[PDB]
Amino acid sequence: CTSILVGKKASIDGSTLISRNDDGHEALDPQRFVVVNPEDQPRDYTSVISKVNVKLPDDPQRYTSIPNSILTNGIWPAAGINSSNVAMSATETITTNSRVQGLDPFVENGLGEEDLVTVVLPYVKSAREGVKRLGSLLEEYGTYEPNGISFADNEEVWWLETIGGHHWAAVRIPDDAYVVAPNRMNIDQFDFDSDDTLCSSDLKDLIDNNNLNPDFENYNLRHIFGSASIKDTVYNNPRTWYGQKFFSPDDTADDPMEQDLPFICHANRKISVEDVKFVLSSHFENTKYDVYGSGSQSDKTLFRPIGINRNHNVHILQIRNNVPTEIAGIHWLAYGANTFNTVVPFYANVNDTPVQYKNATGKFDLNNMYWLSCTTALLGDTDYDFYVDMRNDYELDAMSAYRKIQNDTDADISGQKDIEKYLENANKKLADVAFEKQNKLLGDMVTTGSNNMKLRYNLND
Amino acid sequence: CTSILVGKKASIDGSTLISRNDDGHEALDPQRFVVVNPEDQPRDYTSVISKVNVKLPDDPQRYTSIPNSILTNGIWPAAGINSSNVAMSATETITTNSRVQGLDPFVENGLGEEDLVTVVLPYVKSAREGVKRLGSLLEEYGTYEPNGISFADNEEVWWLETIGGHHWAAVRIPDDAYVVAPNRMNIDQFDFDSDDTLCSSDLKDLIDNNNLNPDFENYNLRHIFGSASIKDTVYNNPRTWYGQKFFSPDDTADDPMEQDLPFICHANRKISVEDVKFVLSSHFENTKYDVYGSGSQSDKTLFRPIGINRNHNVHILQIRNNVPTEIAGIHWLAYGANTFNTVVPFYANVNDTPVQYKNATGKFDLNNMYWLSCTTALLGDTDYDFYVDMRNDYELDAMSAYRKIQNDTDADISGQKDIEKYLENANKKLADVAFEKQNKLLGDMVTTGSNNMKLRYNLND
Amino acid sequence: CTSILVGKKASIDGSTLISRNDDGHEALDPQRFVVVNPEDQPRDYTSVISKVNVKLPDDPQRYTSIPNSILTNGIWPAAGINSSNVAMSATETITTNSRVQGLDPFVENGLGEEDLVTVVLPYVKSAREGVKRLGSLLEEYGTYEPNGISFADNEEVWWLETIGGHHWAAVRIPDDAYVVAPNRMNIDQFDFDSDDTLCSSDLKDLIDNNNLNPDFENYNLRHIFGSASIKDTVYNNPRTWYGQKFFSPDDTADDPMEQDLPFICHANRKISVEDVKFVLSSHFENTKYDVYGSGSQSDKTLFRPIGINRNHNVHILQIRNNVPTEIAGIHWLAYGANTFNTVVPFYANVNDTPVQYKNATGKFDLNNMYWLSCTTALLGDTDYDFYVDMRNDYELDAMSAYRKIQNDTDADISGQKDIEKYLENANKKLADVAFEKQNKLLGDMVTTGSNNMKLRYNLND
Amino acid sequence: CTSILVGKKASIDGSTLISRNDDGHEALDPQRFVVVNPEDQPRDYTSVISKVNVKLPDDPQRYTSIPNSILTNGIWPAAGINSSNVAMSATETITTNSRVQGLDPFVENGLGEEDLVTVVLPYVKSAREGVKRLGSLLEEYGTYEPNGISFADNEEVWWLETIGGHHWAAVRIPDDAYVVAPNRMNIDQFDFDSDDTLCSSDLKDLIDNNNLNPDFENYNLRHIFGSASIKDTVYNNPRTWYGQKFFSPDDTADDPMEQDLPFICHANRKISVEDVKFVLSSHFENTKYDVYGSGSQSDKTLFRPIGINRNHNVHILQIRNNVPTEIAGIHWLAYGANTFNTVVPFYANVNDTPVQYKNATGKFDLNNMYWLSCTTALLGDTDYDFYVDMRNDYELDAMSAYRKIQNDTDADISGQKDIEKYLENANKKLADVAFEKQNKLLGDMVTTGSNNMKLRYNLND
């Protein structure tokens, strides 16, 4: 996974943004876009992987989610926005080390990424409440994974990292800052006296009493609890670097392998949703590390890209401030490898979701946006330079169309007597256009690509 | 397309220059050099592509133009000079983005490059009037394309860029400055209240009220309304870079991909017509990005060149100041890929145009300069290093001959009782010499090239 | 051609030097060393190429010359020294541009390189007079070529460049300076009012009144009248660069393509004849641009070398100051590609020339130094690294022998009752040794080279 | 040849050192180690090559020498130490130029390297006397070669260079300095009145009166009398550079081709015999110019190495100051390519020499150290990286053994009643150990190498 966080003074529109590529192990695994209404939310939750049992409050809020179609390993809701306009994305798999694992081992029947959104998001009314509730659950039930989790509301953005079986720490991202986070523990310098941090009450004592701190001065949490491995230099650090080079070119050096890139960054400009999707779709464009580029075979395959075949979904959760609260929450969503899709700005304030995004099953169905998007990206991968111009045209054309619908819908929000019905209609329009444009792109690729098949022999007359 | 603009204090002769390569989608598409006399100008205009219907004034001025021979997609006049010695070239396709397109979408039945010179140039008496008329027409009819348009008179040079379906902005190029503009939105730092700018009356409000501005301070129009894409780094920015490296070597760094190259520039010397034609004919000579050069296959094909197979026409519109107004307007013109042609300084103050430049049809005819020039450039492309010395000799020889004719014609202008007839004779002499030299060049290439054919076997005795 | 000029305070011996490689279009074209006595000089001269007719004074001075053996295109005397010890070399083909050619075109029945030494050198008694006579002849008869011409006497060295059909400019080289000049216009910064310059009386007015000056300040003649082309960067500038790198290493940068290398230079040491011959024989040794070196095929062939297959003759004209005037004039001479020859210091104060240097015809004859030298260089070219050690040995051995003869001849000059006969005998001794050593070199190359033929099979016992 | 000189304050032990690789034309040419006793020294000397006849004094001193086994071209004694503990090595072939050769040509019946040690060393009692005697003989008899000659006693080290047929100059090396000298004239800045210089009485007049000095100020003898050729950049300068990079790394730049490397140098540490042998055995290790290294074929063969197949002998002549004079003179000696031998510290104060070093003939005999060493080095050359570890072990083991014998012999010197018999016994022990270790090395190489022959097929069981 790759995550990007943006504070409300750092965005182009004064919104908060939290985002993640939901990358799995297998390339394909069908995803659904689903609103969980309170009557359908469990009060007695049991996980599939760990068999953890959690009793949940009887007053859950409605929330958007991105559950797996195939439920063999549980729900895996990934991310969503609740009716208090709180956003949450879980998880970014991060790293740990043997010194802390030796003191606080993973808990086999604890919580995992399978579970976190389901057991946290419906029950909180701010990003800080989300952090605190998740922290409480980790302390009580434990976890069997090293994870990073983002929270946001219209004011604040937070990043929480889990540490061993029960511990955790979290930082409020400054309003004017952004973060790019790969699969490596991220939190660096950490102030135990700050109003902008939270952690296990015993965290400082854990560090101090067990000689966990490698540094002569101060506390850097990933130095203490995380990794700085050789694998980090190729799997993780280059992703951070490329994102920081894009947003902070004059503050970022030219070593993608750097182990101490800052966590919190300040861009040279305000950040758009388009900017976030670009980085989340990237493959080190204009460097020798681009698998579609001009580098040697070894350089082209050295680094894990951000856009990747096993992007199952990408979500950008936006809580806007330039609008009434009933349209503030936007669950931007796309499926499949991010090179050939576009995120669609779905209104989160709805009771149901569009058919092309809700209805994927294990059966291949090109009327569904998961399967259609995956198919497009695979074809594109076979000859990227041949298809990229069509791709670029499609991106501009589709995003323009989404924004027109959003602008029109926003403009007429006043006086609507059935808001959810009004916004469900807007989301249907968005999904319809997204499907039509995705389908037209694949058709254009198939038509032009077929002219360029190996199995051809033309008379040039 | 690629455009170059030169202010009156920046030129070697105190003239204004606006120029463009008229690049199309197909490599070949026959062009004509045509004077549209007032009786030939429509009063009720309807386009072919969009079916926009524009009622035009009943007092059009005579103007030069470069219409397509084949009228399937409309007239496509490209550029010309009117009898008020105002020059116009339309268009340079530029870029846009989804945020502004979402607010002011393209207008399907609006104006396009097909139309602009025809509906603007005949009705204005200054460059500034051209800007204002085009602006009004965009507001009245809309547009379906993102375009850059140049205007000039003997005093001023202006660049207008269209923004969404109806908006626009324009900058007066400083007298001592030049611009190199590729297919990317160009206007950068922008003062709405400056004497040197014009724009939509609502442009600043559009930006401010809709959070379009990505920058912390000030207004940069291409930051706001344009693109800074990966495709820009290979398709657009290197052309700007190569031109600025040629004119401003000590003010230009060594990164062709740079996204924030200046719009307005100041050269280290005064600029000649020969200089402009060189840059408009270039292919990154003496860099690894030259397709005819020594670089790797990937480097050689990485960047879009300026001289290119689909140069349909190249024009340099010159309004001179060292001469009586009746010979101030010069419509420099050539056809086909710019590597093997020369621009000819046609006097614009004429009622008709020379046969070798006027009469191209869809039938291949090597007596016509469009077909002859394309044929020369194609053969030259097959072995550039073999033919370039003949090419270079021809360029000097031809340009010298044109300048002799111009100097002689200028010198005898006083007392001429029929100016148009006098200048038509001069243009006939220019076209006759241009044809003879183009033909001699092709002949020399065919004669020498035939000696070097693959299908050969010589006894070396 | 490549020319090198050295002022009297810049040479190791206080002499003036002017030199040139006389490079033709065809590789071989037999040359002769000939003294033209007054009775054999035309009074009614007509050229072969242009049919120009020039009435000449009835009092010509004796002069050395290097006429073509084959007179199909006229005499082509190249260079010589007259009995006033004035030296002249004509010409170095230079460049021009279309702006000046349009104002002052070439004159088809004008003077050319075929003619210049013949119509100027016999009639002047100083280098400055040479400049003025040539300037006057250009005004009276015109020219059909762009040319650079060197003049020298025991005090001064001048460089004249022709500009269009009739104009010209000339610079006196500072005493302590040198110049390296390729086939490109050379004169840069120019002070019209200096005693060190001469030019067309209307030159400044031509520039000022016709907007020829591209620079914001001052007058740079090659900026105004010459070229700075892409071809210059590979054909011309690297030769200037290599020479300046050799003489002025600490004042010369590392870009061979530089368009604004200085005209007038100051070396870090005094300059010898051996030095001049080295540069005139060079092929970018110890750079990737050496065709005999280690660079890529494209780098090895990118630049025009100074030593080259079409070196027809090389001459270094020396006017000495450490000796009586009767032995001051030395016409150093060699034939064929400069890689495998040596210049021989012939006394110019003679009435006839040595047979091996005088008698080349169109019939191949290895008893003649032209054909023998060409043959040696061709064989050497086939495996330069294999033959270069023999070459280097030969150069030292031959030059040592010439200097011994010169030293002995100089030492015994006092009291000689027939100076011309005494010096003719010395020249015969010089030519005899030159032939013997050239022949011995070729013999050694043939003997050793034959051992290394492809057509071989040896038993290694 | 390559020579290294070390002043008495520059050595690790306070000795003087002069050294040279005696490199011939053919790879192999058997050498002998011979003491010439006074009764066997000619009084009427005639050379073989030049047939020069020299009457010599009737009181020659005993001296060591390294004559050729095959006397076809004369004795060629190379180097030795006389009974006054004066050392001499002749010669290092150097360079010259045509300007001085033209004034003072080689003398065909003069002295050469064949002769010099024989006619100088037996007759002088100091290094300075050696210099003066050689200078006198050059004036009396002349020379037919350009040569450098080293002299030393326990106080001083001198370098003499011959100039033309009769001239010469010499510099006393500063006590704290070293020199590395290749086959190029070496003496640079030169003070005619220093007590540290000696030269031809007319040398300054020769320079001044004949304009031989190329420099604006001062006298640099190799600028005046030597070469700075292209061949120097590959044959000579890189050897100087590599030695200076080794001894003076922080005072030496990174251009091996540099023409003005200093003659006199100052190392960053004191210099050992082991250090000198390393440089004299080197082949640009750890650079791309190492023929046994990782460079391209052209880079690996571009420079002449110091250790080389035609090292016939290497000698390091040491006059010690830490011991009584009767054991001060050490004639370090080895044979064959220096990559696979070790220098042995023979005491010079002896009447005869060890059989393994004295008795080589033209018949191949592996009981002799010349043939055994050559054989070892050839085998080593066939796979250097395979044999180099055995080579390195052998060098340490052998040098350790020699030093033990030297230390024991030095310690027991007092009271030895027959000094020559005592030191001849020591030299026998040294030669015996040297042979045994050289033989063991070759045996180990043959044994391990045989396992790695191409002509093999092993069952891997």
Q: What string of H, E and C letters represents the secondary structure of chain D?
A: CCEEEECCCCECCCCEEEEEEEECCCCCCCECCEEECHHHCCCEEECCCCCCEEECCCCCCCEEECCECCCCCCCCCCEEEECCCCEEEEEEECCCCHHHHCCCCCCCCCECCCCHHHHHHHHCCCHHHHHHHHHHHHHHHCECCCEEEEEECCCCEEEEEEECCCEEEEEECCCCCEEEECCCCCCCECCCCCCCEEECCCHHHHHHHCCCCCCCCCCEHHHHHCCCCHHHHHHCHHHHHHHHHHHCHHHCCCCCCCCCCCCCECCCCCECHHHHHHHHCCCCCCCCCCCCCCCCHHHHCCCCCCCCCCEEEEEEEEECCCCCHHHCEEEEEEECCHHHCCCEEEECCCCCCCHHHHCCCCCCCCCCHHHHHHHHHHHHHHCHHHHHHHHHHHHHHHHHHHHHHHHHHHHCCCCCCCHHHHHHHHHHHHHHHHHHHHHHHHHHHHHHHHHCCCCCCCCCC
- Please spell the DSSP secondary structure of B362-402, one letter per residue: SS--TTSHHHHHHHHHHHHHTTHHHHHHHHHHHHHHHHHHH
Among residues B93, B115, B113, which one has the least CA distance to residue B1?
B93
| Unique residue bearing structure tokens 């001062």 | D218
> How far is Cα B257 from Cα A287, in angstroms, rounded to an integer?
12
> How far is Cα A115 from Cα C137, in angstroms, rounded to an integer?
99
Q: How far is A281 from chain B (nearest CA, A)?
A: 12
Residue of B98, B216, B223 lying closest to A400 (CB–CB) = B98
Peptide bond into B91 cis (omega under 30): yes
Peptide bond into C64 cis (omega under 30): no
| Unique residue bearing structure tokens 């060189």 | B278
Q: How far is D372 from chain C (nearest CA, A)?
A: 22
Q: What string of H, E and C letters represents the secondary structure of chain A?
A: CEEEEECCCCECCCCEEEEEEEECCCCCCCECCEEECHHHCCCEEECCCCCCEEECCCCCCCEEECCECCCCCCCCCCEEEECCCCEEEEEEECCCCHHHHCCCCCCCCCECCCCHHHHHHHHCCCHHHHHHHHHHHHHHHCECCCEEEEEECCCCEEEEEEECCCEEEEEECCCCCEEEECCCCCCCECCCCCCCEEECCCHHHHHHHCCCCCCCCCCEHHHHHCCCCHHHHHHCHHHHHHHHHHHCHHHCCCCCCCCCCCCCECCCCCECHHHHHHHHCCCCCCCCCCCCCCCCHHHHCCCCCCCCCCEEEEEEEEECCCCCHHHCEEEEEEECCHHHCCCEEEECCCCCCCHHHHCCCCCCCCCCHHHHHHHHHHHHHCCHHHHHHHHHHHHHHHHHHHHHHHHHHHHCCCCCCCHHHHHHHHHHHHHHHHHHHHHHHHHHHHHHHHHCCCCCCCCCC
Across the A:B interface, residue pairs with CB atoms under 8 Å apart total 58
Paired tokens of A176: 């004017």
| Sign of the dihedral through C-alpha B99, B100, B104, B108 | negative
Is residue B314 within a helix (H) or strand (E), and if so which, with residue range?
strand B311-319
Q: How far is A11 from chain B (nearest CA, A)?
A: 8
Contact B216 A269 (CB under 8 A): yes
Q: What's the distance, CA A339 to chain centroid? A: 15
Kindly tell me whether chain C and chain A come into contact, counting contact as 3+ Cβ pairs under 8 Å: no
Residue of B272, B322, B407 lying closest to C214 (CB–CB) = B272
Residue of D98, D213, D230 lying closest to C286 (CB–CB) = D230
Question: In this structure, are residues A343 and A314 in contact, taking their beta carbons and an 8 Å threshold?
Answer: yes
Return all residues near C379 (Cβ < 8 A) that are at least 6 apart.
C387, C442, C445, C446, C449
| Amino acid identity at D293 | G
Instruction: Choose from C99, C144, C225, C296 for mutation: most chain B CBs within 10 A.
Output: C99
Contact C396 D96 (CB under 8 A): yes
Contact C231 B286 (CB under 8 A): no
Residue A396 contacts B, CB cutoff 8 Å: yes
Residue A381 contacts B, CB cutoff 8 Å: no
Q: What is the DSSP letter of B201?
A: T
Kindly tell me whether chain B and chain C come into contact, counting contact as 3+ Cβ pairs under 8 Å: yes
| Sign of the dihedral through C-alpha B11, B14, B18, B21 | negative
> How far is Cα C112 from Cα C137, in angstroms, rounded to an integer?
11
Question: In this structure, are residues B171 and B7 in contact, taking their beta carbons and an 8 Å threshold?
Answer: no
Longest dimension (CA), chain D: 83
Q: CA of C186: how far to CAs of A137, C94, C144, in Å?
A: 83, 8, 19
Indicate the SS3 state at residue C261: coil
Instruction: Choose from C392, C400, C433 for mutation: most chain D CBs within 10 A.
Output: C400
| Amino acid identity at D124 | V
Contact A389 B105 (CB under 8 A): no
- Please spell the DSSP secondary structure of B267-305, one letter per residue: -SSPBPHHHHHHHHT-S-TTSTT-TTSSS-HHHHTTS--
Indicate the SS3 state at residue B49: coil
Question: In this structure, are residues A292 and A284 in contact, taking their beta carbons and an 8 Å threshold?
Answer: no
φ/ψ (deg, to 5) at A231: -60, -35
Paired tokens of D319: 């006059």
Residue C421 contacts D, CB cutoff 8 Å: no
Q: Name residues 292-351 of chain C within 8 A of B (Cβ).
A: 296, 298-299, 302
Indicate the SS3 state at residue C333: strand
Among residues B425, B277, B291, B279, which one has the least CA distance to residue B343?
B277
Is residue B311 within a helix (H) or strand (E), and if so which, with residue range?
strand B311-319
| Unique residue bearing structure tokens 């650090």 | A237
Indicate the SS3 state at residue B172: strand
What is the DSSP pairing of strand D63-65 with strand D53-55? unpaired
Q: CA of B12: how far to CAs of B323, B400, C190, C228, D204, in Å?
A: 14, 17, 19, 16, 59
Q: CA of C216: how far to CAs of B177, C224, C461, D393, D400, in Å?
A: 13, 12, 77, 73, 76
- Beta strands, E only, B145-245: 147-152, 157-163, 167-173, 178-181, 197-199
Question: In this structure, are residues A214 and A224 in contact, taking their beta carbons and an 8 Å threshold?
Answer: yes
Report the chain D residue with the minimal C-alpha distance to residue C15. D211
* Burial C104-125, CB ≥16 within 10 A → b, else e: bbbbeebbbbbbbbbbbbbbbe
Paired tokens of B315: 């024009």
Q: What angle do CA B151, B275, B445 make, to 5 degrees?
A: 115
- Contacting chains of D (3 CB pairs or more, <8 Å) are C
Beta bridge partners of B17: B6, B318
Q: How many CB atoms lie within 10 A of CB B153?
A: 25
Peptide bond into A325 cis (omega under 30): no
> How far is Cα D392 from Cα D342, in angstroms, rounded to an integer?
10
* Burial C239-260, CB ≥16 within 10 A → b, else e: bbbbbbbbbbeeebeeebbbbe
Q: CA of D394: how far to CAs of D384, D391, D407, D444, D448, in Å?
A: 14, 5, 20, 10, 15
Question: In this structure, are residues D379 and D449 in contact, taking their beta carbons and an 8 Å threshold?
Answer: yes
Question: In this structure, are residues B376 and B445 in contact, taking their beta carbons and an 8 Å threshold?
Answer: yes
Residue of C13, C269, C286 lying closest to D211 (CB–CB) = C13
Among residues A82, A201, A53, A207, which one has the least CA distance to residue A139?
A201
Indicate the SS3 state at residue B171: strand
- The residue count for chain C: 461
Contact B403 C96 (CB under 8 A): no
Q: What is the DSSP letter of C14?
A: S
> How far is Cα A217 from Cα A460, in angstroms, rounded to an integer?
74
Paired tokens of A452: 């360029």
Question: In this structure, are residues D31 and D334 in contact, taking their beta carbons and an 8 Å threshold?
Answer: no
Residue B184 contacts A, CB cutoff 8 Å: no
Among residues D323, D373, D384, D371, which one has the least CA distance to residue D349?
D323
Chain breaks in chain C (C to N over 2.5 A) after: none
> How far is Cα A142 from Cα A104, in angstroms, rounded to an integer?
10
For residue C403, list chain D residues with Cβ-Cβ distance below 8 A.
98-99, 101-103
> How far is Cα B262 from Cα B180, in angstroms, rounded to an integer?
9
> How far is Cα B349 from Cα B328, in angstroms, rounded to an integer?
8
Residue C359 contacts B, CB cutoff 8 Å: no
Paired tokens of B6: 């030169």
Paired tokens of C445: 């190359």
Q: CA of A318: how far to CAs of A18, A404, C200, in Å?
A: 7, 17, 77
| HSE of D103, CA atoms in CB hemisphere, 13 A | 20
Q: What is the DSSP letter of C270?
A: P
Q: CA of D28: how far to CAs of D22, D278, D308, in Å?
A: 11, 21, 11
Contact C404 D99 (CB under 8 A): no
The radius of gyration of chain A's CA atoms, rounded to the nearest angstrom, is 22
Question: In this structure, are residues A264 and A10 in contact, taking their beta carbons and an 8 Å threshold?
Answer: no
Q: CA of B255: how far to CAs of B71, B239, D362, in Å?
A: 41, 11, 68
Peptide bond into D95 cis (omega under 30): no
Q: How far is C93 from chain B (nearest CA, A)?
A: 14
Q: In what order do the strands lie in the sheet with D79-81?
A: D79-81, D87-93, D147-152, D157-163, D167-172, D197-199
Beta bridge partners of B332: B316, B345
Report the chain C residue with the minimal C-alpha distance to residue B406. C102
Among residues B36, B23, B81, which one has the least CA distance to residue B346?
B81
Return all residues near D90 (Cβ < 8 A) that are at least 6 apart.
D78, D79, D113, D116, D117, D120, D147, D149, D150
The radius of gyration of chain D's CA atoms, rounded to the nearest angstrom, is 22
Is residue B404 within a helix (H) or strand (E), and if so which, with residue range?
helix B384-411
> How far is Cα C377 from Cα C283, in angstroms, rounded to an integer?
14
> How far is Cα C342 from Cα C276, in angstroms, rounded to an integer?
12
Q: How many CB atoms lie within 10 A of CB A254?
A: 8
Residue of C211, C229, C231 lying closest to B322 (CB–CB) = C211
**Given its phi and psi angles, is residue C284 left (phi above 0), alpha (psi -120 to 50 degrees) or beta?**
left
Among residues C71, C200, C67, C181, which one has the least CA distance to residue C131?
C200
Residue A14 contacts B, CB cutoff 8 Å: yes
Q: What's the distance, CA D446 to chain centroid? A: 30
Q: How many CB atoms lie within 10 A of CB A249?
A: 11
Indicate the SS3 state at residue B235: helix
Elucidation technique:
X-ray
Across the C:D interface, residue pairs with CB atoms under 8 Å apart total 57
Is residue C347 within a helix (H) or strand (E), and if so which, with residue range?
strand C344-347
Question: In this structure, are residues A452 and A383 in contact, taking their beta carbons and an 8 Å threshold?
Answer: yes
Resolution reached, in Å? Answer: 1.7
Question: In this structure, are residues B277 and B316 in contact, taking their beta carbons and an 8 Å threshold?
Answer: yes
Q: How far is A7 from chain B (nearest CA, A)?
A: 15
Q: What string of H, E and C letters represents the secondary structure of B81-106?
A: EECCCCEEEEEEECCCCHHHHCCCCC
Q: What's the distance, CA A76 to chain centroid? A: 13
Estimate the share of chain C in helix, then strand, then coil, as percent rounded to the nearest 5.
35, 20, 45
Indicate the SS3 state at residue C208: helix
* Burial D339-367, CB ≥16 within 10 A → b, else e: bbbbbbbbbbbbeebbebbbbbeeeeeee
What is the DSSP pairing of strand C63-65 with strand C53-55? unpaired
For residue B259, list chain A residues with Cβ-Cβ distance below 8 A.
none
Q: How far is D216 from chain C (nearest CA, A)?
A: 6
Question: In this structure, are residues B207 and B224 in contact, taking their beta carbons and an 8 Å threshold?
Answer: yes
Q: CA of C351: how far to CAs of A288, C318, D55, in Å?
A: 72, 18, 52
- Beta strands, E only, B164-284: 167-173, 178-181, 197-199
φ/ψ (deg, to 5) at D231: -60, -35
> How far is Cα C165 from Cα C147, in angstroms, rounded to an integer?
11
Q: What is the dihedral of CA B94, B95, B100, B102, to 10 degrees?
A: 110
Contact D231 C389 (CB under 8 A): yes
Q: How far is B389 from chain C (nearest CA, A)?
A: 9
Catalytic residues of A: 1
